Amino acid sequence: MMPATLANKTFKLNNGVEIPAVGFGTFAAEGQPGQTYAATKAALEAGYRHLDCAWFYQNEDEIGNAIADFLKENPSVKREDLFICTKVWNHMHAPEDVKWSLDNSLKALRLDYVDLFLVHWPIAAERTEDRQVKLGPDGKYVINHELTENPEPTWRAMEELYEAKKARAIGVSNWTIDGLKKLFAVAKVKPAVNQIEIHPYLPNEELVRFCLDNDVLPSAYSPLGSQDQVPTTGERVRDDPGLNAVANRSNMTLAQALLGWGVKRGYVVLPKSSTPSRIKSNIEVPDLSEADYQDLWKVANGRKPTRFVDMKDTFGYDLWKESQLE
Numbered sequence: 001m002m003p004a005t006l007a008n009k010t011f012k013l014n015n016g017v018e019i020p021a022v023g024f025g026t027f028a029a030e031g032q033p034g035q036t037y038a039a040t041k042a043a044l045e046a047g048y049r050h051l052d053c054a055w056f057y058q059n060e061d062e063i064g065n066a067i068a069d070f071l072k073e074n075p076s077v078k079r080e081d082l083f084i085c086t087k088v089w090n091h092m093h094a095p096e097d098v099k100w101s102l103d104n105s106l107k108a109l110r111l112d113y114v115d116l117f118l119v120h121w122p123i124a125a126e127r128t129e130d131r132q133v134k135l136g137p138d139g140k141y142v143i144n145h146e147l148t149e150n151p152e153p154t155w156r157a158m159e160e161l162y163e164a165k166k167a168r169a170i171g172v173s174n175w176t177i178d179g180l181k182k183l184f185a186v187a188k189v190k191p192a193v194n195q196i197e198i199h200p201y202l203p204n205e206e207l208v209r210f211c212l213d214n215d216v217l218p219s220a221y222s223p224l225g226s227q228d229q230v231p232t233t234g235e236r237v238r239d240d241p242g243l244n245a246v247a248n249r250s251n252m253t254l255a256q257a258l259l260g261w262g263v264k265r266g267y268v269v270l271p272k273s274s275t276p277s278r279i280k281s282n283i284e285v286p287d288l289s290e291a292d293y294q295d296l297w298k299v300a301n302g303r304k305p306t307r308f309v310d311m312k313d314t315f316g317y318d319l320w321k322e323s324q325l326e
């Protein structure tokens with residue numbers, strides 16, 4: 001346990017809502033039945049008060065039971081003490097489908113409201129009659145270009161959910177700087193959060209700066225970089241000697257140093273794990289010294305950025321227009 005952990009720290013969103021600086025990522029892209037329940041339960045017991053969820057991962061039902069069981073077991077804690085975030089997927093950007101998606105997520109989570117609701121990608125795709133992702137003849141998402149280029153109808157729907165008090169704050173995920181500029185023009189409620197990939201191999205500094213300078217708070221998914229192993233070089237973030245040197249010299253884990261780096265930059269961090277030992281350890285986020293903070297920055301600044309999450313090939317849509325050359 002870390003008495004000085006920054007797990008007690010919150011940020012204040014531009015509408016006054018407080019968001020815990022550390023949240024637990026619940027994505028379980030590989031099963032099993034019951035694994036999300038155990039992990040979520042472990043996070044709640046370990047002191048997490050921020051849970052990050054999404055319709056896409058199809059496990060909000062297990063999360064709902066975990067929250068309900070945790071609350072039943074711990075009468076001193078109230079649902080209001082938890083910060084719950086979920087997200088609407090790309091095939092559900094039509095206004096009525098946005099509301100349906102939150103209603104569905106609220107049902108599975110066994111909640112009356114969520115603390116944060118996000119548009120998961122700035123990409124609108126067609127859906128099937130039964131509200132699944134419609135696949136085109138190449139097997140990729142079928143893109144609705146009108147709704148993708150002019151997301152106003154989708155955002156109005158988020159605004160209405162927010163005014164209906166079904167979401168205490170609304171935000172975006174994977175939005176770009178230009179995307180934010182376009183949204184600001186048509187938005188009555190400014191997005192409170194932009195959840196994006198942020199870690200030492202992808203510092204995303206220009207977007208992080210633009211958000212902070214504009215009252216949008218970033219939150220970092222993949223804050224540990226994934227163990228996904230950089231594809232053009234075959235190196236892992238968690239094998240990086242510079243990063244490990246800072247952690248080792250300060251008797252902290254590599255993950256804790258990476259999470260402490262993110263909060264120190266001034267944004268939320270959403271570490272994911274299925275492993276109890278790692279769930280427990282990742283809630284112990286240190287307040288980094290100036291030397292540690294700077295040296296991690298040296299690693300980040302000494303290399304070419306590498307984005308681990310790019311669903312180009314699945315979507316049949318290229319948001320970030322990144323190539324081998326150029």
Ligand SMILES: NC(=O)c1ccc[n+]([C@@H]2O[C@H](COP(=O)([O-])OP(=O)(O)OC[C@H]3O[C@@H](n4cnc5c(N)ncnc54)[C@H](OP(=O)(O)O)[C@@H]3O)[C@@H](O)[C@H]2O)c1
Nearest residue numbers: 025026027173221222223224225255271272273274275278
């Ligand atoms: N488009 C979006 O909005 C989006 C995209 C991706 C993710 N997210 C959210 O953010 C979360 C993070 O995504 P991510 O899993 O790709 O990256 P991550 O949080 O940076 O961590 C990925 C992997 O690191 C391992 N790990 C965790 N703690 C560790 C520790 N102390 N020491 C060593 N290894 C550790 C874990 O493996 P084990 O599981 O085996 O323990 C975990 O799978 C997701 O769950 C999700 O809620 C959002």
